[PDB]
């Protein structure tokens, strides 16, 4: 599924995401366009052997089990095709784990070049929330 | 029109406790990522801490229980407390706000701190 | 170190010249973008570069940045007496959780 700004944005919000580990709505909404293109099926393998799975794009090393990942680790305890659900629930739980890593949302890489310092809330900016 | 005054320096003996500040003009420091960056005599860059906008902090290794960042929205002023100071935190102490992606887009003139016996 | 710079860079006025920026798997390796700093002597240090290509208001278009891979670098062209400065890169480390700065380069402009 190919989620809408505004319909992801009220969907993250229904999931607990607003000022999750102080971080406002519009950063999760602006780090899954540019981590997924708020598409819940995108799936990155990289040259280490582990993929990148769906809207948030979570890593199959650390986060979720695929099975195909040499040295794997499932701190979410969940298969990595939970995380391709057209329902964000598990997707959610994971980020809400990987957040608290110690890290932030510098965990995705394209939060921290794209979205951290920017106006995050022009991402729900029109939004009916 | 954007200005960070950094002031609180001084010298301090090795154990010592310091608290700097840095009064911000021309923007809101709760609305913003504020961070401390350090420079000793003649020497490089080093980053020391940083504050979120949400309130999240994160700080250098080197300094890692030492110090602590922190804001006063009504003062609009950014603070770095400064304990147990060792010579090695001699340095000129610059408050910057960032831009994108960590980019420290204003810079404040410094504020030099000294730790010797 | 975590990022690495060559401690000296020299070039004539009008050569160009290129400051390397090394990292690792766990900074620009990773994907983080390179941002660029001028230090002029006396004075707080200025972006110069966000982004790992971008250009701040009022830096001219002798500069330029690249980033591919684990490393980044600065280009400058048409070298004047006035780009005589330290420059520092930085980066963003996930294993170190925090900004880091490369140990900087000093700039000579000889003739």
């Known amino acids: 599924k190919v989620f809408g700004r505004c319909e992801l944005a009220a969907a993250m919000k229904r999931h607990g995401l607003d000022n999750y580990r102080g971080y406002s709505l519009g950063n999760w909404v602006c780090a899954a366009k540019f981590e997924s293109n708020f598409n819940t099926q995108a799936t990155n393998r990289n040259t280490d052997g582990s993929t990148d799975y769906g809207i948030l794009q979570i890593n199959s090393r650390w986060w979720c089990n695929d099975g195909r990942t040499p040295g794997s680790r499932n701190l979410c305890n969940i298969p990595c095709s939970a995380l391709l659900s057209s329902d964000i629930t598990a997707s959610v739980n994971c980020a809400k784990k990987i957040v608290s890593d110690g890290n932030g949302m510098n965990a995705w890489v394209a939060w921290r070049n794209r979205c951290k310092g920017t106006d995050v809330q022009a991402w729900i900016r029109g939004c009916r929330l | 029109q954007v200005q960070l005054v950094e002031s609180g320096g001084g010298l301090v003996q090795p154990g010592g406790s310091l608290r700097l500040s840095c009064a911000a003009s021309?923007?809101?420091?709760?609305?913003?990522?504020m961070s401390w960056v350090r420079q000793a005599p003649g020497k490089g860059l080093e980053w020391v801490s940083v504050?979120?906008?949400?309130?999240?902090?994160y700080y250098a290794d080197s300094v890692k229980g030492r110090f602590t960042i922190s804001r006063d929205n009504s003062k609009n002023t950014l603070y770095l407390q400064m304990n147990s100071l060792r010579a090695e935190d001699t340095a000129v102490y610059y408050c910057?706000?960032?831009?994108?992606?960590?980019?420290?887009?204003?810079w404040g003139k410094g504020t030099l701190v000294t730790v010797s016996s | 170190s975590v990022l690495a710079q060559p401690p000296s860079v020299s070039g004539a006025p009008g050569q160009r010249v290129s400051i390397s920026c090394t990292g690792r798997s766990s900074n620009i390796g990773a994907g983080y973008d390179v941002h660029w700093y001028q230090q002029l002597p006396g004075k707080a240090p200025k972006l110069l570069i966000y982004?790992?290509?971008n250009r701040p208001s009022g830096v001219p278009v002798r500069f330029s940045g690249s980033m591919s891979g684990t490393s980044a670098s600065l280009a400058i062209t048409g070298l004047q007496a006035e780009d005589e400065a330290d420059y520092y890169c930085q980066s963003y480390d996930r294993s170190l959780s925090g900004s880091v700065f490369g140990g900087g380069t000093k700039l000579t402009v000889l003739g």
């Open positions: 910057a706000r960032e831009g994108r992606g960590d980019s420290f887009v204003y």
């Open positions: 021309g923007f809101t420091v709760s609305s913003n990522y």
């Open positions: 982004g790992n290509t």
């Open positions: 504050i979120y906008s949400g309130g999240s902090t």
